[PDB]
Design a protein around this ligand. Sequence first.
Ligand SMILES: O=C(O)C(=O)C[C@@H]1O[C@H](CO)[C@@H](O)[C@@H]1O[C@H]1O[C@H]([C@@H](O)CO)[C@@H](O)[C@H](O[C@H]2O[C@H]([C@@H](O)CO)[C@@H](O)[C@H](O)[C@@H]2O)[C@@H]1O
Ligand SMILES: O=C(O)C(=O)C[C@@H]1O[C@H](CO)[C@@H](O)[C@@H]1O[C@H]1O[C@H]([C@@H](O)CO)[C@@H](O)[C@H](O[C@H]2O[C@H]([C@@H](O)CO)[C@@H](O)[C@H](O)[C@@H]2O)[C@@H]1O
Ligand SMILES: [Ca+2]
Ligand SMILES: [Ca+2]
Ligand SMILES: [Ca+2]
Ligand SMILES: [Ca+2]
Ligand SMILES: [Ca+2]
Ligand SMILES: [Ca+2]
Ligand SMILES: [Ca+2]
Ligand SMILES: [Ca+2]
Ligand SMILES: [Ca+2]
Lengths: 152, 151, 151
Amino acid sequence: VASLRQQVEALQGQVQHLQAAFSQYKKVELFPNGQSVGEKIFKTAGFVKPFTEAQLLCTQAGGQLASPRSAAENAALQQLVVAKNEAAFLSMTDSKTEGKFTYPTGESLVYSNWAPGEPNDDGGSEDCVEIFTNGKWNDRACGEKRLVVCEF
Amino acid sequence: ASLRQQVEALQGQVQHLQAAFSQYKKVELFPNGQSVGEKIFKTAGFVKPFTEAQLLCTQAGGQLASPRSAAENAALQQLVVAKNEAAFLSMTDSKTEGKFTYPTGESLVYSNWAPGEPNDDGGSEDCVEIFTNGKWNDRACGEKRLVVCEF
Amino acid sequence: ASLRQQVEALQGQVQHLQAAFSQYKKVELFPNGQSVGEKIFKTAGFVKPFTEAQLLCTQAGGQLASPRSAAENAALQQLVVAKNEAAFLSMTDSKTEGKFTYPTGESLVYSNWAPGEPNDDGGSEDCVEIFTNGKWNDRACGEKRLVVCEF
Ligand SMILES: O=C(O)C(=O)C[C@@H]1O[C@H](CO)[C@@H](O)[C@@H]1O[C@H]1O[C@H]([C@@H](O)CO)[C@@H](O)[C@H](O[C@H]2O[C@H]([C@@H](O)CO)[C@@H](O)[C@H](O)[C@@H]2O)[C@@H]1O
Ligand SMILES: O=C(O)C(=O)C[C@@H]1O[C@H](CO)[C@@H](O)[C@@H]1O[C@H]1O[C@H]([C@@H](O)CO)[C@@H](O)[C@H](O[C@H]2O[C@H]([C@@H](O)CO)[C@@H](O)[C@H](O)[C@@H]2O)[C@@H]1O
Ligand SMILES: [Ca+2]
Ligand SMILES: [Ca+2]
Ligand SMILES: [Ca+2]
Ligand SMILES: [Ca+2]
Ligand SMILES: [Ca+2]
Ligand SMILES: [Ca+2]
Ligand SMILES: [Ca+2]
Ligand SMILES: [Ca+2]
Ligand SMILES: [Ca+2]
C-alpha cells in the first residue's frame, strides 16, 4: 500500500511538468496564425481558396471552416483577418434554401454579424459568407477566393 | 487509504490534458502536416537542395520523409499536392549505385517508382523525389525540392 | 489493489502523453522555432516595424526576442540565419538616449554589439536588430525587420 503512495506522488510531478510545458507550447503554437477563444481555436492557412476547396481543407484536417457563434468568437476570428488583411470564408451557406443560412450540420444560425444591407444575394448568386477586416459579414459568391480559416 | 481521491483527481487532470493536447495536435498539423499511424510529416514550405534539406531535418530531430508503406506514401502525397511541389525523400543510392537505402543503410521495404524509374539519368541521380501523383523518381541531389521532414 | 489497477492504467496514459508531447515539440519547432533552456524563440516568418512587431508578440502572450546570454543569442541567431533577415530585439533607448533597456525598464544584463555600435545613426536609432552573424546593431524603429517572439 505504501508502494502506491510513491507512484501517485511521482505521477503528480510528471503531470505538473507536462501541464507547465504544454501551457508554454500553446502560446508558441498559435503564434502568429491562431487564436484561442473559450474552448475553440481558429487557425489560418495563410492563403486564399474558393469555398469548396477551403471547406475540404478544414474537414480533411479534422476541423471545419470558421463558424463564430458569439461576439467573442467573431472578434477572435476578426484578429486573424486583420492580421492577414484578407477577408475569410465562414462555414455557413444558403445553398440549400436561398435566404436561409445554415451551418454544415443544417442548423440555423445562433449568431450573425451582417454588414448593413446584407445578405443581398448580389447578381442572384451569393451563397457563401465572408467576414471582413471590420468583423462584419457579407454574402459572397462561393467561387471567389478568400482566406482559409479553420476551427478546431 | 484515501489515495483514491488523489488518483481520481489526477486522472481528471490527465484526461483534460489528453483532450487539450489532442486539439492542439490537430491545430499544429494544419495546413503543413499529416499524421499517419505514429509518424508525423511536416513540410518547411520551401525548397532546398538535398544536403541542405537533410541537415534541416536532422537538426530538427527528425529525418527526411521516408514512406515505408502505401498509407505513409499517400499521406506524404497530400502535402506535396497541397504545395504543388515535388519533395525529397530520405533515401539515396550514393554508396552502391542502383541500391537505394534509408539513412541507416537498410535496403528499401517499400517503393513507388514511376514507370521507367529509377534511371540514373545523366549518370548522376542518387536522390529520390515524390511527385504530386505520389510516384517516385530518382533525381540529382543538387536540384531544389520541397523539404518535408518526418518525426 | 483496485487502486493498483487504476494507477497502472494512469501510468500508461502519462507515459504515452510524455512521448506524444515530446514528438509534438519537435514538430512545432520545425522550422520556425528554437528552444534554449526554458525559453522558446519563434519567428512569424515576416517583417514589421518595431511597434507592430512588439504588439504582435505581447498579444500572443510573449514579447520580442530578448537574449540574455550567449547561448540564447546563438539560438536566436539560427532563426535569423534560416530566414536570412535581421530581426528586432525587445530592447530600446527610447526613454534615455544611449541607455538601452528591456521593456520592464531594467538595464541590459547581456549584449553583443557589432563593432562601432550602438551609433544612433542620423540621431534616430532607438531599436535593436540582430544580424545573421548574431551581432547587434541599433536601428530606426520605423524600419521593417523579422518578427521573433519569445515565450
Ligand atoms: O467589392 C464589392 O464589395 C463588390 O462586389 C461590389 C459590387 O459592385 C457592384 C456595385 O453596384 C455590385 O455588383 C456589388 O455591390 C453590391 O453588392 C455589394 C456586396 O453585397 C457584394 O457581396 C455591396 O457592398 C454593394 O453596396 C454598396 O454599393 C451600393 C450601390 O452604390 C451600388 O450597387 C450602395 O447602395 C451601398 O450603400 C454600398 O455602398 C452593392 O449592394
Ligand atoms: O545598412 C546599413 O548598414 C546602413 O544603414 C548604412 C548607412 O549608410 C550610411 C553610410 O555612410 C550611414 O547612414 C549608415 O552606415 C553607418 O551606420 C551603420 C549602422 O549603424 C546603421 O544602424 C553601419 O553598419 C555602417 O558601417 C558599415 O559600413 C562601414 C563602411 O566602411 C563600408 O564598408 C564599415 O566601417 C562598418 O564596418 C560597417 O560594415 C555605418 O557605420
Ligand atoms: Ca442561391
Ligand atoms: Ca444566397
Ligand atoms: Ca453580398
Ligand atoms: Ca551514383
Ligand atoms: Ca543513382
Ligand atoms: Ca530519374
Ligand atoms: Ca533617441
Ligand atoms: Ca538611440
Ligand atoms: Ca546603428
